[model samples]
Target: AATTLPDGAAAESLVESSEVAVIGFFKDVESDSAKQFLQAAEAIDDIPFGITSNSDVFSKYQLDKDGVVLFKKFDEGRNNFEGEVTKENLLDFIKHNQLPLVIEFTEQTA
Candidate 1:
């Protein structure tokens, strides 16, 4: 299950509250897209997921359409998922971004 973002303030706090989190911007959670988003949330466990239907919340993030956005504690700190909205794509995007942007340069390299 995913967190239901009720307002701009609640959404803002969640993003700032965790080291990493995911938010799905949707017009309505009843739509097909939102269904996929929810499926992805169920598939993933590491990152916290949030979904919002509030227009004010979407406008605050400047999201023109429904999609997934991943927030992190490092690097760009935010990632927009541009691929088709599906459980697989969302899972892939979330998994792929688990790594930090910068890898430590050490005497050991793999």
Candidate 2:
């Protein structure tokens, strides 16, 4: 029940087949913020971190069946914080919770 989609046609097929697709792009984890995020994610022993790619952000975090979080570093200043704040207001969310904040970065297929 499995077949590979032609190279150029794969994207469309992949998106259509999945109930939800997660995508991400990471610049460099050498930065302080990214490093800190990884440290926090690691502290959670109950959760499992799976690395789907070589990029630090992509490969460095705990995920579960509930959902997967994709981290990407796009342009300068682009970050998960923007999306997080919009969801729960970063300042308050962080102040009250110790859980690692999750972000999913996806782009529509053209």
Candidate 3:
């Protein structure tokens, strides 16, 4: 499966540190309840973050559509995709393929 990475310190480090890091992506059809859960999760500083379909509430709810979702991480940077944030560019991807809400997390190991 193809993978895309989000922009972040940890993400960048992963690309640099490991030859291969396992990635998991999910398509969350449940938006409302997921939004509520994310809202609560964000209150705590160390909790992971998610992206939502609602730009305003995205920090909370990760919305999905078309019964599909896509997420990937490359050994490259976010700039790997040019002009990806624009509406036209984003829709371009969505129209042709599925781009799920991207999420990130930090794990602690002892």
Which numbered prediction scores highest in lDDT against the true structure? 1
- What is the number of residue pairs that collide in model 1? 0
Instruction: Please provide, for model 2 over 1-110, each residue's C-alpha lDDT reduced to its tens digit, 9 standing for 90 to 100.
Output: 11222232342334344432222222333444344344544443332222222333333333221122322222221123334212224233223333334576555576
Q: What is the C-alpha lDDT profile of model 1 across 1-110, one tens digit per residue?
A: 68987887877788788887878788878988888888878876666788888888888878887667887777687887885788888888887766754565775857
Candidate 1 similarity to native, TM-score: 0.83
Give the alpha-carbon lDDT of every model: 0.79, 0.31, 0.31
Ranking by lDDT: 1, 3, 2
Candidate 3: clashing pairs of residues: 3-72, 3-73, 4-72, 4-73, 5-72, 5-73
Cα lDDT tens digits, model 3, 1-110, are 22233523343344345433321122342544333333433343321223323322222223232112212344232222133233344334332332334466645566
Off by over 4 Å in 1: 101-110
User: How high is each candidate's TM-score?
Assistant: 0.83, 0.27, 0.21
Worst 10 residues of 1 by lDDT: 98-107
Ordering by TM-score: 1, 2, 3
Residue 104 CA displacement from its true place in model 2, Å:
29
Q: Judged by TM-score relative to the true structure, which candidate is superior, 1 or 3? A: 1
